[PDB]
Amino acid sequence: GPQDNPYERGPDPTEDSIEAIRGPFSVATERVSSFASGFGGGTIYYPRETDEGTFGAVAVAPGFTASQGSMSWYGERVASQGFIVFTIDTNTRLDQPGQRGRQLLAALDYLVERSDRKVRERLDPNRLAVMGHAMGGGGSLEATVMRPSLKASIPLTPWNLDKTWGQVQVPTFIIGAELDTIAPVSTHAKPFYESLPSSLPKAYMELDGATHFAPNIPNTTIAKYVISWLKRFVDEDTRYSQFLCPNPTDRAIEEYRSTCPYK
Ligand SMILES: [Ca+2]
Ligand SMILES: [Zn+2]
Ligand SMILES: [Zn+2]
Ligand SMILES: [Zn+2]
Ligand SMILES: [Zn+2]
Ligand SMILES: [Zn+2]
């Protein structure tokens, strides 16, 4: 309940509520011009109801050649669970993971400093996270090295030629696609996960039968655990621990690794 955690938002969760296309908050959007400094603009999805307090935020990057449209479904699916979600475009579609990491941070700074009052008043600027697909997922990793105060990081089918992440301090949930041929899990997702410190709160979820582009369309397995990870780490909301620990066993999951329990 709220008495034991000022960041709890929404009713106590169930598998129904974390699998739902929409959570308990209605959502509005603020579009941000590509002319914004430091990144290519995007769309901010935010909860409309203010009666429970302010919210943490997650910036969400797409992958190589891709635009915010490839990530749009995350916007309201996650924001409706009580988050500000900023699906960005990058400066160019050809940007690499390091560049994408810088841009994720620029998008977060935009939320804190430059966003429309409707967004700004709903934001707890102390509770920020990153997520991204493919090179954008490599960017999520990069952003956490650049800014260790981030609360959470969710690299989705991540791509990065840098395979070493032993300096990461941010709780990181990597989602792999078993059949990925662009960012194969053998050489991207799994080594990244294994390189993160074993004392870091972390998880690896591999999706059975999934291709590289699985994160770009609604996927209930991705959504429910993205929501749970953000709740646990952005909101410190231990009502969501039940879904993360012990390891999920959903049929769609090829394998799951974790450092449960998350103290
Ligand atoms: Ca720009
Ligand atoms: Zn509570
Ligand atoms: Zn490295
Ligand atoms: Zn499989
Ligand atoms: Zn279940
Ligand atoms: Zn079911």
Automatic annotation (TrEMBL):
Ca(2+) 6 binds at Y256. Zn(2+) 4 binds at E76. Disulfide bonds join C245-C260. Zn(2+) 3 binds at D51, E52. The keyword Calcium applies. Zn(2+) 2 binds at E15. The keyword Electron transport does not apply. Gene3D superfamilies: alpha/beta hydrolase (3.40.50.1820). This is Cutinase. The lineage of its organism: Bacteria, Bacillati, Actinomycetota, Actinomycetes, Pseudonocardiales.
